[PDB]
Design a protein around this ligand. Structure first.
Ligand code: HEM
Ligand SMILES: Cc1cc(N)nc(-c2cc(CN3CC(F)(F)C3)cc(F)c2F)c1
Ligand SMILES: C[C@H](O)[C@H](O)[C@H]1CNc2nc(N)[nH]c(=O)c2N1
Ligand SMILES: [Zn+2]
Length: 415
């Protein structure tokens, strides 16, 4: 009940006691491990007034513990204040300070995130006064421009009004603020990003005018207060894109690949002291492999191993020539080199995983643990030559937290 994790590259052991403060469930049992189930039944998000105060008290207790005024008079009055408000309105409203804390610690607790070394450097944009889809558009544009910061990217989150009844939900329908369109072709194949083929069509059904190419930045589909969502084009001067060149292969430019600088998840739900924030887009900067391995090389994504290997003139007949592997290294050297040559913030999978081991050390020292999801923390290439491969990690669910949630078009009582 005071568990040990080992590193088998360094023989370093750390003792995890933080997992005792865990509340939520993982999906595993004593007899079955679900650690490679992608969206486990637990990781996805109406809630009543009785359940709300334990969640508020728990959250408030750790917040005041963090400002080193645990259980003071200022704490007990805020406990009374929120109890009374959950009497009156059967819900409550976070202080600005409580919101910034909750948000930072949702990131801090995000066990699948390898970049958490940065968890306290988070800009929080309180959008809880927003009322309209145009309001959201404005807030999201300010977010993009701030977080991008001319390529010196900055981490940020924008928190739209919390869920109330459940039928008046603020939702960004985009999975990520900036994504390329997916167009299936009349001959069955797919242009652009096959991940977004459904979403790309949803936008056209609401009226989008597609410039049917590859890297067409999708418009925003913003749903305010449960109302049918509305289309908005992010000013192109706000969407920073990196053309991908290699530092050796000049035919690499003719591949005509590019990516956006800003990774900005918009479809998750932020949970703070039992309050549910259905629209909470958050952004950092990219680890190279996200674009160069997954985005470019997943069979279900751009799938460029085929044509990259061609132009390298590779032994493509035999599986064991490792032509896929060789082509995949070049692709991620190019992604990295291109972002850096433009002063656009990006991190290589070696630097990021080393920082995470450093982050784990700090969490196990000044916090007693660090929830970590090995399946997700290990990079999708060169796994064992990064230090996280050899690092035992205890996964467990802490709160505040980012949670998955259904795609809004499966759940939105429409009109
Ligand atoms: C600062 C630079 C950051 C880097 C380099 C980074 C890195 C990553 C990577 C590589 C992933 C895996 C993504 C995937 O495989 O799809 C991830 C996931 C995630 N990131 Fe971070 N991240 C950063 C900032 C942030 C911020 C600012 C937040 C929120 C405030 C955040 C929250 C999350 C969450 C919740 C996930 C997991 C999503 C899921 O469970 O599917 N990250 N991050
Ligand atoms: C803040 C941040 C930094 C960074 N480097 N990456 C991401 C990032 C996260 C995800 C997770 N998504 C939720 C899902 F499970 F649906 C897949 C998907 C992406 F495409 C990303 F770019 C986010
Ligand atoms: C089956 C498995 O759970 C699924 O492919 C996961 C594996 N690990 C991952 N790790 C990260 N970082 N991102 C992912 O999308 C996935 N996908
Ligand atoms: Zn397990």
């Amino acid at each position: 009940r005071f568990l040990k994790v080992k590193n088998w590259e360094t023989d370093v052991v750390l003792t995890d006691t933080l997992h005792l403060k865990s509340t939520l469930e993982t999906g595993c049992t004593e007899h079955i491990c679900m650690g490679s189930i992608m969206l486990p039944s637990q990781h996805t998000r109406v809630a009543t007034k009785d359940q709300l105060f334990p969640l508020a008290k728990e959250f408030l207790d750790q917040y005041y513990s963090s400002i080193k005024r645990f259980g003071s008079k200022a704490h007990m009055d805020r406990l009374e204040e929120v109890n009374k408000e959950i009497e009156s309105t059967s819900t409550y409203q976070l202080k600005d300070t409580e919101l910034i804390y909750g948000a930072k610690h949702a990131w801090r607790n995000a066990s699948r995130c390898v970049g958490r070394i940065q968890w306290s450097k988070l800009q929080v944009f309180d959008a809880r006064d927003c009322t309209t889809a145009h309001g959201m558009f404005n807030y999201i544009c300010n977010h993009v421009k701030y977080a991008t910061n001319k390529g010196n990217l900055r981490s940020a989150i924008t928190i739209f009004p919390q869920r109330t009844d459940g039928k008046h939900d603020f939702r960004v329908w985009n999975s990520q603020l900036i994504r390329y369109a997916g167009y299936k072709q009349p001959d069955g194949s797919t242009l652009g990003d096959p991940a977004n083929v459904q979403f790309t069509e949803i936008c056209i059904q609401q009226g989008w005018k597609a410039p049917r190419g590859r890297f067409d930045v999708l418009p925003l589909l913003l749903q305010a207060n449960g109302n049918d969502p509305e289309l908005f084009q992010i000013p192109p001067e706000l969407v920073l894109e990196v053309p991908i060149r290699h530092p050796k292969f000049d035919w690499f430019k003719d591949l005509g690949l590019k990516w956006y600088g800003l990774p900005a998840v918009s479809n998750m739900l932020l949970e703070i002291g039992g309050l549910e924030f259905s629209a909470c887009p958050f952004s950092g900067w990219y680890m190279g492999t996200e674009i160069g391995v997954r985005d470019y090389c997943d069979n279900s994504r751009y799938n460029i191993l085929e044509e990259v290997a061609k132009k390298m003139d590779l032994d493509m007949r035999k599986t064991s020539s490792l032509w896929k592997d060789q082509a995949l290294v070049e692709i991620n050297i190019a992604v990295l080199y291109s972002f850096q040559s433009d002063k656009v913030t990006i991190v290589d999978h070696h630097s990021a995983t080393e920082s995470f081991i450093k982050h784990m050390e700090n969490e196990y020292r000044c916090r007693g643990g660090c929830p970590a999801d090995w399946v997700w923390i290990v990079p999708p290439m060169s796994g064992s030559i990064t230090p996280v491969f050899h690092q035992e990690m205890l996964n467990y669910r802490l709160t505040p937290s980012f949670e998955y949630q259904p795609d809004p078009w499966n759940t939105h009582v429409w009109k």
